[PDB]
Amino acid sequence: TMCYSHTTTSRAILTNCGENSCYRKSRRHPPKMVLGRGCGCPPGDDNLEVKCCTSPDKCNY
Amino acid sequence: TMCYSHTTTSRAILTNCGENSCYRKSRRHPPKMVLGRGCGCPPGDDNLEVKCCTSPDKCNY
Amino acid sequence: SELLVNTKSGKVMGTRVPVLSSHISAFLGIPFAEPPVGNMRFRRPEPKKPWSGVWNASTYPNNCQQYVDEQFPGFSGSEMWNPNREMSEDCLYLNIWVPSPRPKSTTVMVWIYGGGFYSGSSTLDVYNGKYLAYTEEVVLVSLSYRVGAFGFLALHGSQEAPGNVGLLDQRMALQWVHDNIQFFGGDPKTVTIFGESAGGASVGMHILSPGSRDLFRRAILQSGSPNCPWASVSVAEGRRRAVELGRNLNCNLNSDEELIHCLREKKPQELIDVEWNVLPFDSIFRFSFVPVIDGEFFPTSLESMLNSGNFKKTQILLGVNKDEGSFFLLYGAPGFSKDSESKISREDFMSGVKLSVPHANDLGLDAVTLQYTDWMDDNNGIKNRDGLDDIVGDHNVICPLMHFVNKYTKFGNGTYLYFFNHRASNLVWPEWMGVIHGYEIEFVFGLPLVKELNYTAEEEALSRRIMHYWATFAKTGNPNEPHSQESKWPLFTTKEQKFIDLNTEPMKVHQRLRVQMCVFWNQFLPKLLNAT
Amino acid sequence: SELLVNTKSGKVMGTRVPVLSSHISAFLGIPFAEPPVGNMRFRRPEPKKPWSGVWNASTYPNNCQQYVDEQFPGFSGSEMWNPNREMSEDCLYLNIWVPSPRPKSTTVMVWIYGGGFYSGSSTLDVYNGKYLAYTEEVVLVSLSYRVGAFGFLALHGSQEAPGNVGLLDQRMALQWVHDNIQFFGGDPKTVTIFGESAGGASVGMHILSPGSRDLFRRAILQSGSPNCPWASVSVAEGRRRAVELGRNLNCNLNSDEELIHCLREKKPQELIDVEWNVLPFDSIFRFSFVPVIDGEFFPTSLESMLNSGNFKKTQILLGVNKDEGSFFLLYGAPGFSKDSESKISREDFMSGVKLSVPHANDLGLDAVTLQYTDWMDDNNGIKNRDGLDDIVGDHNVICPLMHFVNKYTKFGNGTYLYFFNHRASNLVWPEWMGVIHGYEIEFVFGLPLVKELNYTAEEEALSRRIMHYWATFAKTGNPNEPHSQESKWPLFTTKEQKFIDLNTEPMKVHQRLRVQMCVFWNQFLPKLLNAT
Ligand SMILES: *[C@@H]1O[C@H](CO)[C@@H](O)[C@H](O)[C@H]1NC(C)=O
Ligand SMILES: *[C@@H]1O[C@H](CO)[C@@H](O)[C@H](O)[C@H]1NC(C)=O
Ligand SMILES: [Zn+2]
Ligand SMILES: [Zn+2]
Ligand SMILES: [Zn+2]
Ligand SMILES: [Zn+2]
């Protein structure tokens, strides 16, 4: 699964996640901002809103 | 001088005032309402606004 | 004969009034109460003691003691509203137009006149019911009731000057129509009251009062409402005004008995002269003596009654006119005049704005100003005139009516709303005044059907359509004829809020009558004033 | 040679950059401050110690440590604003484009970039000054300054983290342009600063601060203002945010020294991750670390400075865009999306309305709702989208700018106002976003003159007209050329309040830019909130 990958100080690249999930961690409350992407699916809290998707490609936009 | 004449319970008629003045007594503050007309020019207060005119005719409209 | 009808209080005799081509029966001047003269002044009405012989109900009754507006001496636009008969304390009468031949049991429409509660006369030419009664073939009654101090001086507590006396006069008229209207060919069960300005507020005050709910089946409120800002006052405010009327005549104010007895010794002429002193503020569309929320005639506060539902639950057909505030601006509002296009300057708009809403605070007046101002042209005399015209109509008529509609519709048995926006082609008022307050009555009463009045062909059709809606609503309880015609006047609902315009053009169904402005008046401003 | 210029801090060497047909001299990367690394993080800047030999000013400098917005990964509408160079704590540099051949003494324009004070890069392609400097033949400088915590962490009292450090960076850049710009062919006396969004707020914050008033002659504020709701915070609020940034990294908060030392030990990567936690509320167009009204850099409260007059009194050329709030709605406001026509439901409008103005109370939010709602169509997705678009632009940019204009014009030495309302023909943002925040910069910087960019013939003319107004204003102090051309851009006055639109159509002079809405925002709402 082709997915985006980056941090708060990185530009989004499209690395290949295996059969693994792709996340899209953000700031739950407005301004709901993306604070990271990549392969995996970390835990969060009220403040963070991780959004894991295994399909299709570029699914963590 | 032909002028209007009436009270708060009378319809306006056009009687002839001599060489005398015609008034138009009203309620100074809104609703500025006519409370009387005729020949003369009585005194008033903050509440009453007498308006005397000697010309032309029907001048106290 | 037909001109002879025996009523519960005695025998009555009327006359054949010519209606267009035909003629109709009319009983002008039937007493429904003992002349409220003597000590009876200010007191609750008394039933008219039964007479011996045939009463002569052929000539129009006396009008009630009131103020004559000679603002525009000899102007037919103003003088036509002044009492045309003789004024007198013995004015509690009623008139009846019965379709010839007398019907067995037909719909009854009872008219309640307006006049800010300080004026009124069932005998006006715009209140002539031979056309409506004859056209729709319904019995038409138009009542009388004391106005001003005579019918509304209200010292809560005292028994000789309680308060809602003017409304008690109307209720006595309705109770007579309830008992006796069958002997004239009218159905006491299908009786519907209808009135304009203060009469509509009365119709609304009869729909709220317990003792008046079982004297009528349906109702109609034209340009008026029980909750209008000018229609009522507390039992304290009215008391303040009673005492004020007293000190204005040099009366003993020590107690009610001493005050009331004094005012009774005064000629009726004397009360009317000092009546406007009763106005505590300095404004527009605010009167002297009006009904008081007694806790007797009006159980609780009108709003409480509206919320809980405490009110007669029938169907109503109500509405307003495009320009309700116009006429009211001609009595002091800076820049206005009947003889000009009354273009208002910014500073005169601000002045008038302070007059239209005498209850708001500075921030509320800023709220009003910002709402009714074109900041991209705050100096346009036309926009300032109109936004000031709109402030009086909305605040004083249109919104209080839309507030009553929504509350009532929650417990109503059907509701219809209109918006009369046609300007009479033969109107003598200045173009800028638009569709004026009270200028629908002549369409309701069928005047435009009289060739001698100089209306247009399309105007006769509008009056016929309005007369019909009014009558059909009175009988059916729905303006719309079943399986007949095509035009469908939408039943007003709190959801879609449909209503229709009343003009000489196709039946146009609109929705939400002045909602942005009435949200400001009804919901927002009240919130602002209380949070401040 | 020409590419060789000796400055007060050392010798510099630039390169010949190709500008359209000709070429121009450019000194990319001149240090104006000691790299704020080590213990120097959070502290006030230091002058760049003079170097030995020729500095190589041919390649673009480093960008400052900041957040990269990958909201729309690979979207050229967003990615073009992200730092294009390498981010680094050693980013305090400046760039200079000198018309070839070098001028003797020409006008200097200094650009201050925007980015809500948390982002920014003088090295963007929309900030490329070879076109403007070459076209109007003026020396063009574009500075650098620390953003976010690095340039704005503010613990009032402490000397290692005082506060307005990011602005102190700009002032150091201006002082270098003051001392050294003559050696490049620029007139230190005719220097005018100009910037967008936060840069414009900075231009405004330089016009208010005493220590920055004698480093520039004139000024320009594009879509920004010192008094913008998002531009500043108290010395307490900023302190709250500093401590919050600390506990978010598990720092010792016992004292400033212990807090500040801790944050300095952290990788710059670490500060940016927990930076948005600094946002206390839950809203739109509100940032983390912004200037604090120190009582040092900013004597008193901005408003006080505006009222009394306490501010540099020169001429300014300021303005706004039609749709300033659009982009800001794409970060959480329910119903919005770059990929749809973002039609908003009533309930989502109410939600967003609560987000746009995070400072108002319920009655204030009712005030906002009633103002920006079409009650005759409170469910129209287009009107709700637009009224929500307007709430962000007016509250956050348009009105705060109109408030600054009126205050300044009372002591200003001439003022010009614009309203850029042309939508780029080659815009990659969704049609519903209109004329977006920051989308005028490409007209100011002459991009549309480059055939390879795909603009229209009429668009090159607009950029040329805007470049010209900007340059002529910088020299003359008046956008309008004397005895030349016909189009006359009216000088803004507090009386008639004239301004002009900036589009590819005839010079249209309007008056009162968003007055009804800005009376609500500027005058009324503030009154309401305080009375409650
Ligand atoms: C009363 O009825 C009689 C009978 O026709 C009529 O002549 C008279 O006009 C009516 N009333 C008065 C006051 O004349
Ligand atoms: C510094 O100047 C030289 C001289 O031409 C140039 O080749 C070089 O690209 C510049 N800087 C860097 C980092 O290469
Ligand atoms: Zn009795
Ligand atoms: Zn004046
Ligand atoms: Zn030093
Ligand atoms: Zn929903």
Side-chain angles (χ1 to χ4, degrees), chain A, chain B, chain C residues 1-482 489-532, chain D residues 1-482 489-532:
Chain A
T1 39
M2 302 300 271
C3 296
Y4 296 116
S5 178
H6 70 77
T7 39
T8 30
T9 55
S10 159
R11 278 233 185 146
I13 54 183
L14 182 68
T15 75
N16 182 17
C17 295
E19 311 284 50
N20 201 17
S21 49
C22 304
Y23 68 88
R24 172 254 167 61
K25 176 177 48 182
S26 304
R27 179 192 142 82
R28 171 158 292 134
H29 304 289
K32 304 180 173 182
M33 56 205 355
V34 180
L35 310 174
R37 291 191 184 103
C39 319
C41 191
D45 46 21
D46 296 88
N47 310 331
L48 287 175
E49 178 188 314
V50 181
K51 174 227 149 185
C52 316
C53 58
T54 55
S55 58
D57 287 338
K58 297 183 179 78
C59 78
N60 46 359
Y61 185 92
Chain B
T1 39
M2 302 300 271
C3 296
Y4 296 116
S5 178
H6 70 77
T7 39
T8 30
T9 55
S10 159
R11 278 233 185 146
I13 54 183
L14 182 68
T15 75
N16 182 17
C17 295
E19 311 284 50
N20 201 17
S21 49
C22 304
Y23 68 88
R24 172 254 167 61
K25 176 177 48 182
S26 304
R27 179 192 142 82
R28 171 158 292 134
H29 304 289
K32 304 180 173 182
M33 56 205 355
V34 180
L35 310 174
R37 291 191 184 103
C39 319
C41 191
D45 46 21
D46 296 88
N47 310 331
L48 287 175
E49 178 188 314
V50 181
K51 174 227 149 185
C52 316
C53 58
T54 55
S55 58
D57 287 338
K58 297 183 179 78
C59 78
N60 46 359
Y61 185 92
Chain C
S1 69
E2 182 191 1
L3 310 194
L4 188 55
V5 168
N6 186 186
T7 78
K8 169 187 181 188
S9 57
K11 290 174 189 168
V12 175
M13 176 178 243
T15 36
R16 308 183 168 302
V17 300
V19 192
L20 304 178
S21 283
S22 285
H23 70 106
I24 220 188
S25 305
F27 301 85
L28 321 176
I30 310 167
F32 68 78
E34 216 58 41
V37 196
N39 302 302
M40 309 203 100
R41 184 194 281 175
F42 299 141
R43 289 183 180 168
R44 306 186 181 65
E46 289 277 298
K48 177 63 173 181
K49 287 187 185 194
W51 58 94
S52 51
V54 178
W55 186 279
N56 186 46
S58 61
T59 307
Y60 262 139
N62 273 161
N63 292 340
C64 303
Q65 295 293 18
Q66 59 178 270
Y67 162 80
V68 188
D69 225 312
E70 294 300 311
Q71 193 69 27
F72 309 108
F75 185 31
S76 54
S78 63
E79 307 281 82
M80 88 157 162
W81 305 96
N82 275 328
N84 60 343
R85 280 296 167 156
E86 287 172 17
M87 288 180 311
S88 188
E89 305 194 275
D90 177 20
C91 66
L92 299 187
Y93 295 83
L94 62 69
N95 319 307
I96 310 179
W97 284 272
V98 184
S100 179
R102 185 181 314 158
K104 278 293 189 305
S105 191
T106 187
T107 300
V108 179
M109 286 194 290
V110 183
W111 169 264
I112 301 178
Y113 64 58
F117 286 127
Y118 66 91
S119 66
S121 319
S122 53
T123 65
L124 306 194
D125 310 76
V126 277
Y127 297 174
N128 186 323
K130 72 188 172 167
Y131 307 102
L132 175 48
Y134 161 78
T135 290
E136 301 292 310
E137 293 150 63
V138 292
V139 169
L140 172 48
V141 189
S142 62
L143 60 85
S144 309
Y145 71 89
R146 287 171 279 169
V147 293
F150 302 97
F152 296 94
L153 181 71
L155 296 165
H156 187 75
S158 67
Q159 269 293 131
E160 306 167 31
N164 299 298
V165 160
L167 288 168
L168 293 171
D169 287 2
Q170 296 177 24
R171 193 173 72 175
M172 178 156 292
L174 296 175
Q175 174 66 80
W176 191 101
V177 177
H178 175 275
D179 305 324
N180 309 241
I181 219 61
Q182 54 193 282
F183 305 116
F184 296 86
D187 189 1
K189 298 172 181 174
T190 297
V191 169
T192 104
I193 60 182
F194 77 145
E196 204 273 342
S197 182
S202 297
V203 171
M205 300 166 132
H206 277 317
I207 289 180
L208 305 184
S209 189
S212 300
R213 282 129 137 173
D214 299 309
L215 302 175
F216 60 95
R217 187 87 154 284
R218 282 176 278 287
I220 301 175
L221 306 82
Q222 301 160 206
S223 316
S225 178
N227 67 279
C228 291
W230 49 267
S232 58
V233 299
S234 46
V235 313
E237 182 50 42
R239 164 165 278 259
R240 293 174 173 130
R241 308 194 171 193
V243 185
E244 179 56 19
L245 186 73
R247 59 155 294 283
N248 242 283
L249 283 172
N250 300 283
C251 284
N252 177 308
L253 313 173
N254 292 153
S255 188
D256 282 332
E257 285 320 319
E258 291 173 290
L259 160 54
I260 315 168
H261 273 313
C262 176
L263 291 178
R264 292 216 250 84
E265 301 182 298
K266 302 302 165 167
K267 271 183 172 186
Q269 291 74 44
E270 302 184 70
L271 313 191
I272 305 175
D273 288 44
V274 298
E275 190 197 317
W276 295 99
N277 231 310
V278 165
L279 295 167
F281 291 53
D282 192 3
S283 64
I284 305 182
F285 214 146
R286 218 58 38 149
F287 319 93
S288 342
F289 300 102
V290 292
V292 298
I293 309 306
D294 250 309
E296 298 180 59
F297 193 109
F298 301 103
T300 52
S301 57
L302 309 188
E303 190 64 18
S304 298
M305 306 196 82
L306 293 170
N307 293 345
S308 56
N310 191 341
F311 59 74
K312 189 187 167 71
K313 303 132 185 170
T314 183
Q315 40 273 91
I316 56 172
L317 173 119
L318 66 192
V320 289
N321 285 29
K322 196 175 212 167
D323 304 279
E324 300 277 2
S326 65
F327 174 80
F328 301 86
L329 290 171
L330 305 185
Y331 291 60
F336 291 96
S337 190
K338 185 201 77 170
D339 314 307
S340 65
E341 292 276 78
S342 299
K343 301 167 179 171
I344 312 301
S345 64
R346 185 53 191 188
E347 103 200 282
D348 282 348
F349 168 97
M350 309 170 69
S351 298
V353 163
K354 299 172 177 174
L355 298 173
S356 290
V357 193
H359 58 96
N361 54 20
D362 298 292
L363 176 55
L365 299 181
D366 277 316
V368 180
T369 297
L370 172 64
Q371 180 91 26
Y372 290 88
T373 289
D374 181 348
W375 295 107
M376 212 69 85
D377 207 336
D378 60 358
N379 285 308
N380 191 311
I382 296 174
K383 293 175 189 159
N384 286 329
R385 182 196 56 200
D386 294 339
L388 204 48
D389 184 346
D390 295 355
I391 289 184
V392 197
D394 304 5
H395 165 58
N396 289 291
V397 175
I398 302 183
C399 297
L401 179 132
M402 293 302 316
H403 176 59
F404 166 86
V405 182
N406 273 255
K407 285 298 175 178
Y408 190 85
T409 312
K410 298 176 184 180
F411 305 87
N413 203 266
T415 299
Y416 294 86
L417 187 59
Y418 75 88
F419 191 72
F420 182 87
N421 62 24
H422 172 74
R423 194 178 196 269
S425 62
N426 53 5
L427 208 46
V428 300
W429 286 96
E431 313 84 359
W432 71 266
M433 290 179 72
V435 193
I436 329 180
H437 181 87
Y439 283 73
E440 7 83 37
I441 302 176
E442 49 198 75
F443 277 85
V444 169
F445 281 73
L447 303 196
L449 310 195
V450 182
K451 267 64 173 292
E452 296 96 63
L453 295 191
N454 302 320
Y455 283 78
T456 72
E458 292 84 8
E459 288 177 329
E460 168 192 16
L462 185 52
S463 177
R464 292 187 164 284
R465 278 166 44 197
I466 289 179
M467 276 188 310
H468 190 63
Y469 289 153
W470 267 229
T472 301
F473 175 76
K475 316 185 181 180
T476 301
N478 171 324
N480 293 294
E481 307 84 85
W489 178 336
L491 169 92
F492 173 93
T493 56
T494 47
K495 301 173 178 179
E496 299 152 288
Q497 301 210 342
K498 301 194 166 194
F499 76 86
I500 67 158
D501 286 349
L502 279 180
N503 58 81
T504 49
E505 289 296 297
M507 220 285 292
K508 293 173 184 175
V509 177
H510 304 268
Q511 292 184 215
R512 306 171 188 221
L513 178 52
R514 296 199 68 71
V515 166
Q516 190 180 71
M517 292 309 134
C518 288
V519 162
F520 162 60
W521 287 111
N522 287 350
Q523 304 147 36
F524 185 75
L525 191 50
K527 286 201 62 174
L528 169 51
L529 288 177
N530 278 42
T532 58
Chain D
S1 69
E2 182 191 1
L3 310 194
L4 188 55
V5 168
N6 186 186
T7 78
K8 169 187 181 188
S9 57
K11 290 174 189 168
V12 175
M13 176 178 243
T15 36
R16 308 183 168 302
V17 300
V19 192
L20 304 178
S21 283
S22 285
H23 70 106
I24 220 188
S25 305
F27 301 85
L28 321 176
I30 310 167
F32 68 78
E34 216 58 41
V37 196
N39 302 302
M40 309 203 100
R41 184 194 281 175
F42 299 141
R43 289 183 180 168
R44 306 186 181 65
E46 289 277 298
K48 177 63 173 181
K49 287 187 185 194
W51 58 94
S52 51
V54 178
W55 186 279
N56 186 46
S58 61
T59 307
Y60 262 139
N62 273 161
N63 292 340
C64 303
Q65 295 293 18
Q66 59 178 270
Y67 162 80
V68 188
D69 225 312
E70 294 300 311
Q71 193 69 27
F72 309 108
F75 185 31
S76 54
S78 63
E79 307 281 82
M80 88 157 162
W81 305 96
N82 275 328
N84 60 343
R85 280 296 167 156
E86 287 172 17
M87 288 180 311
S88 188
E89 305 194 275
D90 177 20
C91 66
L92 299 187
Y93 295 83
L94 62 69
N95 319 307
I96 310 179
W97 284 272
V98 184
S100 179
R102 185 181 314 158
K104 278 293 189 305
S105 191
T106 187
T107 300
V108 179
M109 286 194 290
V110 183
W111 169 264
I112 301 178
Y113 64 58
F117 286 127
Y118 66 91
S119 66
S121 319
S122 53
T123 65
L124 306 194
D125 310 76
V126 277
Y127 297 174
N128 186 323
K130 72 188 172 167
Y131 307 102
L132 175 48
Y134 161 78
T135 290
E136 301 292 310
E137 293 150 63
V138 292
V139 169
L140 172 48
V141 189
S142 62
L143 60 85
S144 309
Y145 71 89
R146 287 171 279 169
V147 293
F150 302 97
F152 296 94
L153 181 71
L155 296 165
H156 187 75
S158 67
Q159 269 293 131
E160 306 167 31
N164 299 298
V165 160
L167 288 168
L168 293 171
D169 287 2
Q170 296 177 24
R171 193 173 72 175
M172 178 156 292
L174 296 175
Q175 174 66 80
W176 191 101
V177 177
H178 175 275
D179 305 324
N180 309 241
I181 219 61
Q182 54 193 282
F183 305 116
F184 296 86
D187 189 1
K189 298 172 181 174
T190 297
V191 169
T192 104
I193 60 182
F194 77 145
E196 204 273 342
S197 182
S202 297
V203 171
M205 300 166 132
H206 277 317
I207 289 180
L208 305 184
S209 189
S212 300
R213 282 129 137 173
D214 299 309
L215 302 175
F216 60 95
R217 187 87 154 284
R218 282 176 278 287
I220 301 175
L221 306 82
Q222 301 160 206
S223 316
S225 178
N227 67 279
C228 291
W230 49 267
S232 58
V233 299
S234 46
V235 313
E237 182 50 42
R239 164 165 278 259
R240 293 174 173 130
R241 308 194 171 193
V243 185
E244 179 56 19
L245 186 73
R247 59 155 294 283
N248 242 283
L249 283 172
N250 300 283
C251 284
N252 177 308
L253 313 173
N254 292 153
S255 188
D256 282 332
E257 285 320 319
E258 291 173 290
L259 160 54
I260 315 168
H261 273 313
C262 176
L263 291 178
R264 292 216 250 84
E265 301 182 298
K266 302 302 165 167
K267 271 183 172 186
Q269 291 74 44
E270 302 184 70
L271 313 191
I272 305 175
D273 288 44
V274 298
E275 190 197 317
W276 295 99
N277 231 310
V278 165
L279 295 167
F281 291 53
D282 192 3
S283 64
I284 305 182
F285 214 146
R286 218 58 38 149
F287 319 93
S288 342
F289 300 102
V290 292
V292 298
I293 309 306
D294 250 309
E296 298 180 59
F297 193 109
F298 301 103
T300 52
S301 57
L302 309 188
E303 190 64 18
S304 298
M305 306 196 82
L306 293 170
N307 293 345
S308 56
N310 191 341
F311 59 74
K312 189 187 167 71
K313 303 132 185 170
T314 183
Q315 40 273 91
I316 56 172
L317 173 119
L318 66 192
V320 289
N321 285 29
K322 196 175 212 167
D323 304 279
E324 300 277 2
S326 65
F327 174 80
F328 301 86
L329 290 171
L330 305 185
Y331 291 60
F336 291 96
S337 190
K338 185 201 77 170
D339 314 307
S340 65
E341 292 276 78
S342 299
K343 301 167 179 171
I344 312 301
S345 64
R346 185 53 191 188
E347 103 200 282
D348 282 348
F349 168 97
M350 309 170 69
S351 298
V353 163
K354 299 172 177 174
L355 298 173
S356 290
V357 193
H359 58 96
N361 54 20
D362 298 292
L363 176 55
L365 299 181
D366 277 316
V368 180
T369 297
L370 172 64
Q371 180 91 26
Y372 290 88
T373 289
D374 181 348
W375 295 107
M376 212 69 85
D377 207 336
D378 60 358
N379 285 308
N380 191 311
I382 296 174
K383 293 175 189 159
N384 286 329
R385 182 196 56 200
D386 294 339
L388 204 48
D389 184 346
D390 295 355
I391 289 184
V392 197
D394 304 5
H395 165 58
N396 289 291
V397 175
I398 302 183
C399 297
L401 179 132
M402 293 302 316
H403 176 59
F404 166 86
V405 182
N406 273 255
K407 285 298 175 178
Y408 190 85
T409 312
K410 298 176 184 180
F411 305 87
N413 203 266
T415 299
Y416 294 86
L417 187 59
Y418 75 88
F419 191 72
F420 182 87
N421 62 24
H422 172 74
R423 194 178 196 269
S425 62
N426 53 5
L427 208 46
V428 300
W429 286 96
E431 313 84 359
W432 71 266
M433 290 179 72
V435 193
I436 329 180
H437 181 87
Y439 283 73
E440 7 83 37
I441 302 176
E442 49 198 75
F443 277 85
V444 169
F445 281 73
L447 303 196
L449 310 195
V450 182
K451 267 64 173 292
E452 296 96 63
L453 295 191
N454 302 320
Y455 283 78
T456 72
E458 292 84 8
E459 288 177 329
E460 168 192 16
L462 185 52
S463 177
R464 292 187 164 284
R465 278 166 44 197
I466 289 179
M467 276 188 310
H468 190 63
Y469 289 153
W470 267 229
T472 301
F473 175 76
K475 316 185 181 180
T476 301
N478 171 324
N480 293 294
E481 307 84 85
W489 178 336
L491 169 92
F492 173 93
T493 56
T494 47
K495 301 173 178 179
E496 299 152 288
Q497 301 210 342
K498 301 194 166 194
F499 76 86
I500 67 158
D501 286 349
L502 279 180
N503 58 81
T504 49
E505 289 296 297
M507 220 285 292
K508 293 173 184 175
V509 177
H510 304 268
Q511 292 184 215
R512 306 171 188 221
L513 178 52
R514 296 199 68 71
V515 166
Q516 190 180 71
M517 292 309 134
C518 288
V519 162
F520 162 60
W521 287 111
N522 287 350
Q523 304 147 36
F524 185 75
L525 191 50
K527 286 201 62 174
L528 169 51
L529 288 177
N530 278 42
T532 58

